[PDB]
Amino acid sequence: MMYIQVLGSAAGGGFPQWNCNCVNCKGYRDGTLKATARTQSSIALSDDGVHWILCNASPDIRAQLQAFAPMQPARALRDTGINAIVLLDSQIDHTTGLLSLREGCPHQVWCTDMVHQDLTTGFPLFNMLSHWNGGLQWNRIELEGSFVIDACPNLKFTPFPLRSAAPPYSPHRFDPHPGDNLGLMVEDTRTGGKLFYAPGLGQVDEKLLAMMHGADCLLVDGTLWEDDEMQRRGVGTRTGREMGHLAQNGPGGTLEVLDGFPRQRKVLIHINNTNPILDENSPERAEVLRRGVEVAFDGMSIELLEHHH
């Protein structure tokens, strides 16, 4: 079995977002919206249910670990079910949780050279945390080939660089490089079962599509329903294209893309607080369901048992 646990399913800011009173956030607080609160984007993976690899360490990590019992196996006075961390980018919503793991260093952290550069300069987590019992031990994710983390020896990870959209603090946001952003294929090598995980997806091409057809489950960017959602909700002016996100709806959107993948389990994750698919009663949620696409929620468990071929 490959076990996938969704710790957090929201985009940056979570749901509801602390400073937002958009129709969803305010509707949630007022008790009029049928929706469930979500913490920030993060999943955990395991090949045995005991040793876990954390993919992205969100600012909500304390609440996320608390909610998932295998995160505390209680085998010793100090213990954790996290055996390694993999980072897919250097965004604040995917890295700030490392600060909350300071009491448990050293930790093995896998990330690209690009991300390690951000996390030793602009957001210098590797430098800061080194003062807590050795801190973060960097394992380089190369831009080709695959890697296996010893704690989960049956999971083989193959990174795929995606279009670079480095965070605003990055000494190179204006000068994007391959390795700023990854999607990950993860294979259980006992069964061939494969997960493709890309919480940020701003572009697809034929190479990416072909590689995705090899997957059994696609767990992909669900940030916005429409490219101009933030303007429609009155909560800003950024578009999906500016932020590196393919919206669900419209030409070139992810629902059009996912139409090419009938055999795969398809799950949207990293959903912004503005996205109507969070409202369980919306026509947008009904449309995703009609298309065989699921909307990730906190605490969702995905089990991959086998490969489709």
Instruction: Report how far residue 92's alpha carbon sits from residue 13's, in angstroms, rounded to the nearest whole number.
Output: 10
Q: Residues with Cβ < 8 Å from 117, sequence gap 6 or more?
A: 171, 172
Residue (7 or 302) nearer to Na ion, CB: 7
- Out of a copy of itself, Mn ion, Zn ion, none, what residue 29 binds, judged by CB under 5 to 8 A for its kind, is a copy of itself
Q: Which stretch binds a copy of itself (CB under 8 A): 41-49, 71-79, 175-183, 188-196?
A: 71-79
Residue (22 or 155) nearer to Zn ion, CB: 22
Instruction: Report how far residue 42's alpha carbon sits from residue 65's, in angstroms, rounded to the nearest whole number.
Output: 11
DSSP symbol at 207: H
Q: Which stretch binds Zn ion (CB under 5 A): 10-18, 58-66, 130-138, 206-214?
A: 10-18
Closest C-alpha among 135, 67, 72 to residue 98: 135
- Residue 80 binds to a copy of itself (criterion: CB under 8 A): yes
- Residue 270 binds to a copy of itself (criterion: CB under 8 A): no
Instruction: Report how far residue 46's alpha carbon sits from residue 149's, in angstroms, rounded to the nearest whole number.
Output: 11
Instruction: Report how far residue 289's alpha carbon sits from residue 241's, in angstroms, rounded to the nearest whole number.
Output: 25
Query: Cα–Cα–Cα angle for 175, 179, 180, nearest 5°?
Result: 55
Look at residue 61 and give its three-state secondary structure. helix
The token pair at 1 is 């079995």
Residue (30 or 206) nearer to a copy of itself, CB: 30
Site string for Zn ion, 260-279 (x = CB under 5 A): -------------x------
Residue (31 or 262) nearer to Zn ion, CB: 31
- Residue 229 binds to Mn ion (criterion: CB under 5 A): no
- Residue 183 binds to Mn ion (criterion: CB under 5 A): no
Residue (12 or 193) nearer to a copy of itself, CB: 12
Q: Which of the residues 57 through 96 are near Mn ion (CB under 5 A)?
A: 93
Tell how far CA 171 is from the center of its chain: 23
Look at residue 252 and give its three-state secondary structure. coil
Exactly one of 168, 251, 262, 283 binds a copy of itself (CB under 8 A); that residue is 168
Provide, rounded to whole angstroms, the least separation between the CB of residue 272 and Na ion. Answer: 5
Cβ-closest position to Na ion = 12
Which value, in Å, is the radius of gyration of the alpha carbons in the chain?
18
Q: Residues with Cβ < 8 Å from 242, sequence gap 6 or more?
A: none
Chain contacts with Na ion (rule: CB under 5 A): 11-13, 272
Residues that bind Zn ion in the complex, under the rule CB under 5 A: 17, 20, 22, 25, 273
